[PDB]
Short mmCIF file of C-alpha atoms in Angstrom, two decimals:
data_model
loop_
_atom_site.label_atom_id
_atom_site.label_comp_id
_atom_site.label_asym_id
_atom_site.label_seq_id
_atom_site.Cartn_x
_atom_site.Cartn_y
_atom_site.Cartn_z
CA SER A 144 -7.33 15.10 -43.23
CA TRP A 145 -9.06 16.17 -40.34
CA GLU A 146 -8.76 18.34 -37.07
CA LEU A 147 -7.59 16.95 -33.72
CA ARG A 148 -7.21 19.31 -30.71
CA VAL A 149 -5.04 18.37 -27.88
CA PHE A 150 -4.66 20.06 -24.17
CA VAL A 151 -1.29 21.70 -23.53
CA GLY A 152 -1.61 23.65 -20.24
CA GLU A 153 0.75 22.56 -17.21
CA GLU A 154 -0.78 24.50 -14.25
CA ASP A 155 -4.75 24.40 -15.62
CA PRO A 156 -4.62 21.58 -18.64
CA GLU A 157 -7.42 23.24 -20.45
CA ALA A 158 -5.72 26.59 -20.78
CA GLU A 159 -3.31 26.02 -23.70
CA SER A 160 -4.64 24.08 -26.45
CA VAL A 161 -2.76 23.22 -29.82
CA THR A 162 -4.46 22.06 -33.15
CA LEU A 163 -3.45 19.73 -35.33
CA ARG A 164 -3.83 18.19 -39.15
CA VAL A 165 -3.99 14.25 -38.73
CA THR A 166 -5.01 11.81 -41.24
CA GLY A 167 -6.31 8.82 -39.22
CA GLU A 168 -3.22 7.28 -40.52
CA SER A 169 -1.25 9.73 -38.26
CA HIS A 170 0.99 7.90 -35.60
CA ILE A 171 1.39 8.50 -32.04
CA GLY A 172 4.97 9.55 -32.37
CA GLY A 173 4.00 11.89 -35.34
CA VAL A 174 1.35 13.62 -33.34
CA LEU A 175 3.59 13.98 -30.33
CA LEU A 176 6.31 15.93 -32.77
CA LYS A 177 3.35 17.83 -34.18
CA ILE A 178 2.30 18.98 -30.73
CA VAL A 179 6.13 19.94 -29.59
CA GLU A 180 6.48 21.82 -32.72
CA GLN A 181 3.35 23.97 -32.04
CA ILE A 182 4.96 25.18 -28.68
CA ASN A 183 7.10 27.94 -28.23
CA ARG A 184 9.34 26.50 -25.53
CA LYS A 185 12.40 24.38 -25.64
CA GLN A 186 13.02 21.88 -23.13
CA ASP A 187 13.31 18.40 -22.42
CA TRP A 188 10.33 16.72 -24.33
CA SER A 189 11.16 12.64 -23.59
CA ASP A 190 9.16 12.22 -20.81
CA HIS A 191 5.80 13.90 -22.23
CA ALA A 192 2.83 11.59 -23.48
CA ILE A 193 -0.76 11.72 -24.23
CA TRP A 194 -3.39 10.90 -21.81
CA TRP A 195 -6.68 9.84 -23.57
CA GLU A 196 -9.69 10.68 -21.01
CA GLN A 197 -12.31 8.26 -22.40
CA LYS A 198 -10.60 5.33 -22.32
CA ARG A 199 -8.48 6.14 -19.21
CA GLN A 200 -5.12 5.51 -20.97
CA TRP A 201 -1.99 6.64 -22.13
CA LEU A 202 -1.11 6.65 -25.82
CA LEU A 203 2.27 4.84 -25.21
CA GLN A 204 2.35 2.87 -28.54
CA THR A 205 4.33 5.51 -30.66
CA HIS A 206 3.81 3.51 -33.90
CA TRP A 207 -0.20 2.88 -33.69
CA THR A 208 -2.20 5.18 -35.73
CA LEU A 209 -5.15 7.39 -34.48
CA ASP A 210 -7.15 4.73 -36.12
CA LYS A 211 -5.82 1.76 -34.40
CA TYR A 212 -6.34 3.32 -31.10
CA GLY A 213 -9.98 4.43 -32.16
CA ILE A 214 -9.45 8.19 -31.73
CA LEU A 215 -11.67 10.65 -33.30
CA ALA A 216 -12.17 14.22 -33.26
CA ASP A 217 -14.23 14.01 -29.93
CA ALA A 218 -11.18 12.31 -27.86
CA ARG A 219 -9.98 14.44 -25.14
CA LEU A 220 -6.26 14.08 -25.39
CA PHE A 221 -3.96 15.80 -22.53
CA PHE A 222 -0.45 16.36 -23.63
CA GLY A 223 1.87 16.31 -20.05
CA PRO A 224 4.63 14.76 -18.58
CA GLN A 225 4.47 11.44 -17.58
CA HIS A 226 6.61 11.98 -14.07
CA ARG A 227 4.56 14.32 -11.34
CA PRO A 228 4.98 14.92 -7.87
CA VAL A 229 3.42 13.16 -5.03
CA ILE A 230 3.44 13.37 -1.45
CA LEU A 231 4.75 9.86 0.14
CA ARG A 232 3.79 9.38 3.48
CA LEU A 233 5.99 6.82 5.36
CA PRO A 234 5.19 3.94 7.77
CA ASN A 235 7.00 6.07 10.49
CA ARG A 236 4.65 8.99 9.71
CA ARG A 237 6.80 11.36 7.97
CA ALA A 238 5.92 12.70 4.35
CA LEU A 239 8.36 13.08 1.53
CA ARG A 240 7.93 14.67 -1.55
CA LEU A 241 8.85 12.64 -4.52
CA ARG A 242 8.79 11.99 -8.45
CA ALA A 243 6.71 9.22 -9.61
CA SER A 244 5.49 7.80 -13.01
CA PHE A 245 1.77 8.38 -13.40
CA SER A 246 2.20 5.98 -16.24
CA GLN A 247 4.05 2.60 -15.22
CA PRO A 248 2.18 0.06 -13.55
CA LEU A 249 1.81 0.76 -10.02
CA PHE A 250 4.40 -2.40 -8.91
CA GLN A 251 7.13 -0.67 -11.02
CA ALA A 252 6.44 2.76 -9.51
CA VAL A 253 6.64 0.93 -6.14
CA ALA A 254 10.01 -0.88 -7.32
CA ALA A 255 11.43 2.71 -8.11
CA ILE A 256 10.34 4.42 -4.98
CA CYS A 257 12.07 1.46 -2.82
CA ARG A 258 14.87 1.67 -4.60
CA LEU A 259 15.30 5.40 -3.79
CA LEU A 260 14.70 4.69 -0.03
CA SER A 261 17.12 1.51 -0.01
CA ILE A 262 14.00 -0.68 1.20
CA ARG A 263 14.67 -4.31 -0.45
CA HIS A 264 12.04 -6.78 -1.56
CA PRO A 265 9.42 -3.68 -2.45
CA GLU A 266 6.81 -6.54 -3.67
CA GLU A 267 6.07 -6.87 0.08
CA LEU A 268 5.10 -3.09 -0.23
CA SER A 269 2.17 -1.38 -1.93
CA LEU A 270 0.31 2.01 -1.99
CA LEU A 271 -2.69 3.23 -0.57
CA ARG A 272 -4.91 6.31 -1.64
CA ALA A 273 -5.72 8.87 0.77
CA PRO A 274 -8.96 7.94 3.28
CA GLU A 275 -12.52 9.12 2.25
CA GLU A 276 4.89 19.52 6.96
CA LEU A 277 7.21 18.53 4.35
CA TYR A 278 10.41 16.25 4.73
CA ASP A 279 13.21 15.88 2.28
CA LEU A 280 15.11 12.87 1.16
CA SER A 281 17.95 11.87 3.91
CA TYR A 282 19.27 8.36 5.57
CA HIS A 283 18.47 9.92 8.93
CA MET A 284 14.98 10.32 8.50
CA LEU A 285 14.46 6.83 7.05
CA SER A 286 17.05 4.98 9.13
CA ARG A 287 16.34 6.27 12.56
CA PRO A 288 13.33 5.83 14.42
CA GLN A 289 10.87 8.50 15.16
CA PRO A 290 10.35 9.84 18.67
CA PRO A 291 6.99 9.08 20.67
CA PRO A 292 4.01 11.06 19.52
CA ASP A 293 2.07 13.34 21.76
CA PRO A 294 -0.73 10.84 23.54
CA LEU A 295 -2.86 13.80 22.57
CA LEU A 296 -2.85 13.09 18.85
CA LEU A 297 -3.01 9.43 19.90
CA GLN A 298 -6.45 9.98 21.33
CA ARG A 299 -7.91 12.15 18.96
CA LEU A 300 -7.05 10.15 15.65
CA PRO A 301 -9.46 7.74 14.46
CA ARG A 302 -9.04 4.53 15.71
CA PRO A 303 -10.66 0.94 15.05
CA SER A 304 -13.08 -0.65 17.93
CA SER A 305 -14.60 -3.22 15.73
CA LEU A 306 -13.22 -6.14 13.79
CA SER A 307 -15.70 -4.50 10.92
CA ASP A 308 -13.59 -1.15 11.65
CA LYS A 309 -10.53 -2.80 10.52
CA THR A 310 -11.95 -3.79 7.09
CA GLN A 311 -11.77 0.25 6.17
CA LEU A 312 -8.07 0.44 5.62
CA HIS A 313 -7.85 -2.41 2.93
CA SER A 314 -10.41 -0.38 0.76
CA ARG A 315 -7.54 1.94 -0.03
CA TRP A 316 -4.98 -0.30 -1.83
CA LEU A 317 -4.33 0.40 -5.27
CA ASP A 318 -4.04 -1.50 -8.36
CA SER A 319 -0.84 -2.95 -8.99
CA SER A 320 -1.34 -3.94 -12.21
CA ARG A 321 -2.31 -0.70 -13.23
CA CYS A 322 -1.08 3.04 -13.50
CA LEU A 323 -1.79 6.04 -10.98
CA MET A 324 -3.47 8.16 -13.73
CA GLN A 325 -5.81 5.27 -14.48
CA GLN A 326 -6.68 4.98 -10.71
CA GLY A 327 -7.63 8.61 -10.00
CA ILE A 328 -4.61 9.76 -8.60
CA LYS A 329 -3.11 13.32 -9.82
CA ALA A 330 -0.26 15.31 -9.29
CA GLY A 331 0.23 16.64 -5.26
CA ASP A 332 -1.86 13.77 -3.63
CA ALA A 333 -0.66 11.78 -1.04
CA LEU A 334 0.28 8.28 -1.15
CA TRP A 335 0.74 5.99 1.77
CA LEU A 336 3.49 3.72 1.24
CA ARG A 337 3.03 0.32 3.52
CA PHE A 338 3.99 -3.27 4.05
CA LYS A 339 1.02 -5.16 2.44
CA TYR A 340 2.23 -8.67 2.74
CA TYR A 341 3.24 -10.07 6.18
CA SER A 342 5.66 -12.15 4.51
CA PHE A 343 9.31 -10.77 4.98
CA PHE A 344 12.03 -12.72 2.95
CA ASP A 345 15.23 -12.19 4.77
CA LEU A 346 14.93 -9.85 7.08
CA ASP A 347 18.21 -9.16 8.76
CA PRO A 348 19.05 -6.53 11.52
CA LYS A 349 22.36 -5.98 9.61
CA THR A 350 21.65 -5.26 6.15
CA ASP A 351 18.30 -3.33 5.77
CA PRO A 352 18.40 -0.42 8.44
CA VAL A 353 15.81 1.40 6.50
CA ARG A 354 13.36 -1.50 5.51
CA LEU A 355 13.68 -2.65 9.32
CA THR A 356 12.96 0.77 10.77
CA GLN A 357 9.92 1.27 8.59
CA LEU A 358 8.66 -1.84 9.46
CA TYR A 359 8.90 -1.18 12.81
CA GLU A 360 7.29 1.85 12.50
CA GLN A 361 4.46 0.31 10.77
CA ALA A 362 4.04 -2.14 13.49
CA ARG A 363 4.46 0.59 16.30
CA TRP A 364 1.76 2.58 14.68
CA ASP A 365 -0.67 -0.37 13.97
CA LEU A 366 -0.48 -0.85 18.14
CA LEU A 367 -0.26 2.84 19.10
CA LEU A 368 -3.40 3.18 16.84
CA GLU A 369 -5.23 -0.15 17.85
CA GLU A 370 -5.25 -1.33 14.33
CA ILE A 371 -4.22 -4.69 16.38
CA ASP A 372 -4.82 -5.88 19.82
CA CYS A 373 -2.51 -6.91 22.25
CA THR A 374 -3.14 -7.82 26.16
CA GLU A 375 -1.74 -5.43 29.07
CA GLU A 376 1.30 -7.61 29.53
CA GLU A 377 1.69 -7.53 25.64
CA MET A 378 1.76 -3.29 25.59
CA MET A 379 4.32 -3.37 28.82
CA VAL A 380 6.99 -4.95 26.80
CA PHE A 381 5.86 -3.09 23.45
CA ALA A 382 6.17 0.24 25.54
CA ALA A 383 9.42 -1.00 26.86
CA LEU A 384 11.21 -1.75 23.49
CA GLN A 385 9.94 1.62 21.90
CA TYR A 386 11.38 3.57 24.77
CA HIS A 387 14.78 1.37 24.62
CA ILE A 388 14.74 2.11 20.66
CA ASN A 389 14.06 5.75 21.26
CA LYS A 390 16.91 6.37 23.93
CA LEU A 391 19.53 4.38 21.85
CA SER A 392 18.54 6.59 18.81
CA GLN A 393 19.11 9.72 20.72
CA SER A 394 22.57 9.00 22.05
CA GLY A 395 23.38 7.98 18.40
CA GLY A 396 10.13 11.91 32.22
CA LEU A 397 9.62 8.56 30.83
CA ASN A 398 6.03 10.01 29.52
CA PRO A 399 4.61 6.56 29.11
CA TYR A 400 1.35 7.82 27.66
CA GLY A 401 3.28 8.38 24.51
CA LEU A 402 4.32 4.79 24.31
CA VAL A 403 0.78 2.91 24.83
CA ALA A 404 -2.46 2.65 23.12
CA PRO A 405 -5.18 4.87 24.12
CA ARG A 406 -7.09 2.35 26.00
CA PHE A 407 -4.60 2.25 28.39
CA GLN A 408 -4.12 5.44 28.85
CA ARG A 409 -7.60 5.99 29.59
CA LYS A 410 -7.31 2.77 32.27
CA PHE A 411 -4.04 3.33 33.86
CA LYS A 412 -2.50 6.60 35.61
CA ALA A 413 1.00 7.56 34.29
CA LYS A 414 2.15 6.57 37.79
CA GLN A 415 0.84 3.17 37.48
CA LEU A 416 2.22 2.96 33.97
CA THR A 417 5.87 4.00 34.53
CA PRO A 418 7.14 0.92 37.10
CA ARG A 419 5.47 -1.56 34.81
CA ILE A 420 7.30 -0.51 31.95
CA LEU A 421 10.36 -0.04 33.58
CA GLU A 422 10.05 -3.43 34.86
CA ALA A 423 9.67 -4.70 31.57
CA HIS A 424 12.50 -2.71 30.25
CA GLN A 425 14.65 -4.71 32.62
CA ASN A 426 14.23 -7.70 30.23
CA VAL A 427 15.36 -5.58 26.92
CA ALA A 428 18.17 -3.15 28.31
CA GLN A 429 21.09 -5.27 26.77
CA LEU A 430 19.50 -5.45 23.24
CA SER A 431 21.22 -3.13 20.24
CA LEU A 432 18.73 -0.56 18.54
CA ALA A 433 18.31 -3.16 15.72
CA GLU A 434 17.93 -6.39 17.90
CA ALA A 435 15.28 -4.43 19.78
CA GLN A 436 13.28 -3.46 16.53
CA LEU A 437 13.21 -6.70 15.61
CA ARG A 438 12.22 -8.07 19.01
CA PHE A 439 9.52 -5.65 18.54
CA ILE A 440 8.39 -7.11 15.18
CA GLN A 441 8.65 -10.90 16.37
CA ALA A 442 6.31 -9.88 19.39
CA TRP A 443 4.09 -8.33 16.80
CA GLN A 444 3.95 -11.51 14.70
CA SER A 445 3.22 -13.10 17.64
CA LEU A 446 -0.19 -11.51 18.23
CA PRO A 447 -3.42 -13.70 17.77
CA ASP A 448 -4.91 -11.16 15.11
CA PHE A 449 -1.31 -10.65 13.18
CA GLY A 450 -0.73 -10.91 9.75
CA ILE A 451 -4.66 -10.79 8.72
CA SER A 452 -6.29 -8.24 6.19
CA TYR A 453 -10.01 -8.06 7.03
CA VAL A 454 -12.67 -7.46 4.03
CA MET A 455 -16.36 -7.52 4.40
CA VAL A 456 -17.68 -9.77 2.10
CA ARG A 457 -21.02 -11.49 1.27
CA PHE A 458 -20.75 -15.34 0.66
CA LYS A 459 -22.82 -16.92 -2.16
CA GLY A 460 -26.08 -18.23 -1.04
CA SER A 461 -25.57 -16.03 2.41
CA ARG A 462 -28.16 -13.67 3.95
CA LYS A 463 -25.84 -11.63 5.98
CA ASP A 464 -22.22 -9.74 5.37
CA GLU A 465 -19.24 -11.51 7.19
CA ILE A 466 -15.52 -11.21 7.41
CA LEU A 467 -13.03 -12.65 5.18
CA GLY A 468 -9.49 -12.55 6.74
CA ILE A 469 -6.75 -12.68 4.21
CA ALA A 470 -3.35 -14.35 5.83
CA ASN A 471 -0.10 -15.29 4.05
CA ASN A 472 -1.05 -18.84 3.97
CA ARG A 473 -4.85 -19.04 4.26
CA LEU A 474 -8.59 -17.57 3.94
CA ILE A 475 -10.82 -17.51 6.95
CA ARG A 476 -14.40 -17.04 7.10
CA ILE A 477 -15.38 -14.98 10.15
CA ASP A 478 -19.24 -14.97 11.51
CA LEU A 479 -20.06 -11.75 12.74
CA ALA A 480 -23.08 -12.65 14.75
CA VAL A 481 -20.90 -15.61 16.19
CA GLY A 482 -17.44 -13.28 16.58
CA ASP A 483 -15.63 -16.60 15.89
CA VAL A 484 -13.72 -18.02 12.77
CA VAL A 485 -15.91 -20.67 11.31
CA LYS A 486 -13.92 -22.09 8.46
CA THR A 487 -10.48 -21.80 6.82
CA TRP A 488 -9.13 -22.40 3.41
CA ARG A 489 -5.38 -23.21 3.25
CA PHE A 490 -3.58 -21.76 0.32
CA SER A 491 -1.63 -25.09 -0.29
CA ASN A 492 -5.14 -26.36 -0.82
CA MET A 493 -5.95 -23.60 -3.63
CA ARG A 494 -5.99 -24.50 -7.44
CA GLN A 495 -7.20 -21.44 -9.15
CA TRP A 496 -9.04 -18.47 -8.49
CA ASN A 497 -10.73 -15.58 -10.73
CA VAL A 498 -13.29 -12.93 -10.66
CA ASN A 499 -16.85 -13.65 -12.45
CA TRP A 500 -16.56 -10.07 -13.92
CA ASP A 501 -20.41 -9.94 -14.43
CA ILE A 502 -21.46 -10.90 -11.08
CA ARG A 503 -18.34 -8.67 -9.16
CA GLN A 504 -17.86 -12.08 -7.17
CA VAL A 505 -14.51 -13.95 -6.45
CA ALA A 506 -14.65 -17.68 -7.01
CA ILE A 507 -11.93 -19.91 -5.81
CA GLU A 508 -11.65 -23.79 -6.45
CA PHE A 509 -9.55 -25.94 -3.59
CA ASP A 510 -8.54 -29.35 -3.57
CA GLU A 511 -10.93 -32.12 -3.67
CA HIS A 512 -13.75 -29.96 -5.86
CA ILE A 513 -14.32 -27.63 -2.79
CA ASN A 514 -15.71 -24.29 -4.24
CA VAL A 515 -15.82 -20.86 -2.33
CA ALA A 516 -17.61 -17.79 -3.81
CA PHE A 517 -18.33 -14.21 -2.74
CA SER A 518 -18.90 -10.78 -3.43
CA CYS A 519 -16.92 -7.95 -2.19
CA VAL A 520 -18.75 -5.40 0.18
CA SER A 521 -15.56 -3.45 1.38
CA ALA A 522 -12.49 -3.13 -0.97
CA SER A 523 -13.24 -4.74 -4.47
CA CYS A 524 -12.97 -7.79 -6.30
CA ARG A 525 -9.32 -6.39 -7.71
CA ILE A 526 -8.06 -5.78 -4.39
CA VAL A 527 -8.92 -9.47 -3.00
CA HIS A 528 -7.83 -11.11 -6.07
CA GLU A 529 -4.52 -9.38 -6.14
CA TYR A 530 -4.07 -9.96 -2.27
CA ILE A 531 -4.49 -13.70 -2.62
CA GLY A 532 -2.40 -14.12 -6.09
CA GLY A 533 0.25 -11.47 -4.03
CA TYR A 534 0.81 -14.14 -1.50
CA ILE A 535 1.08 -16.72 -3.87
CA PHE A 536 3.21 -14.86 -5.49
CA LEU A 537 5.56 -14.45 -2.70
CA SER A 538 5.61 -18.05 -1.50
CA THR A 539 7.55 -18.52 -4.73
CA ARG A 540 10.51 -16.66 -3.49
CA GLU A 541 12.59 -19.36 -2.20
CA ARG A 542 13.34 -20.19 -6.07
CA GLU A 543 15.54 -11.60 -9.91
CA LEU A 544 11.68 -10.72 -9.23
CA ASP A 545 9.40 -12.72 -11.71
CA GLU A 546 7.06 -9.99 -12.89
CA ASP A 547 5.14 -12.20 -15.84
CA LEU A 548 4.56 -14.55 -12.84
CA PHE A 549 3.15 -11.79 -10.56
CA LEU A 550 0.95 -10.21 -13.26
CA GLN A 551 -0.82 -13.70 -14.13
CA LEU A 552 -1.24 -14.71 -10.33
CA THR A 553 -2.55 -11.26 -9.30
CA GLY A 554 -5.16 -11.12 -12.64
CA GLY A 555 -3.17 -8.10 -14.44
#
């Protein structure tokens, strides 16, 4: 019969404490009720749990003992709500304040978020942490395209200018087999909701207005912020489509600099840009809003670099860092000295993929005993492993969401 202290403060967690006589045989459900007991307040307690700092783990096993968990008098235990506020930044750039579980595995939290936002197929989306004002929930904000930005915003936001720059984003993906609390996210932090896997199941104009709009917005911002490349001509049709989408949104000058990537803004005068955009607009003026959004997506899907998530890696036996491209059906190896793809491995030929955790190295086996190994320079082994297994999991879809398969394939 010994002494266990549990932190109980809401604002500063460590401000208020409660102290309990616990016997090592004490069950988590018991200690939870003993904590609530020594708190003056009356409220709903059904969301509260204990976070064990040292093991980075929630004590969700109601009927395990402190001994089973390995808790002693030194363990730093935090009693608090499982659900906490986050700022969710949407692909359309708007922010929303939402309640998220800090204890569910991330993919469940994403499924919940997407359920609230009426976005089908949440398995295609995930969350990114912050790099190294606020709106409230509504249909209009989620379903209507957002007006063209100030051109100055485009010129002043950070933009990639090399293949290697494009690896930075992918370091920010959270682990979908783990919970937010486990991954360093605190109440009130910003999380970015993005389409992660460029493999969109059953995307139709009619059924998915929020899904369509958000995907469109993600594609749009990738182009405007030069996350993906396109030609001059391609930019003019992208610009014409944005203009058309926006004009249709409004009724239920042209400012062409609000419609094109900065490299075009700095190359062409607004006067030179307008006629070319109007010209391209002639080819798309007949389309409905949803048809034009789909058209924009399809033209984006046709770009040479489309659908590739770049990760900086070092292949086994290699003396230089190289780029690994992750696409929906394949892995590609890019030699930075060459500038070119030098090797492709098809997912159709993939047998098994693992992380050897002692050397922090991804190892993949292919048909005819072809073996590829590499350490991860940007991102992490967990990121690459999940991305690969995620794609394989999604290719299963033609046939409810088989969560167990997803977790085995992504190494959770």
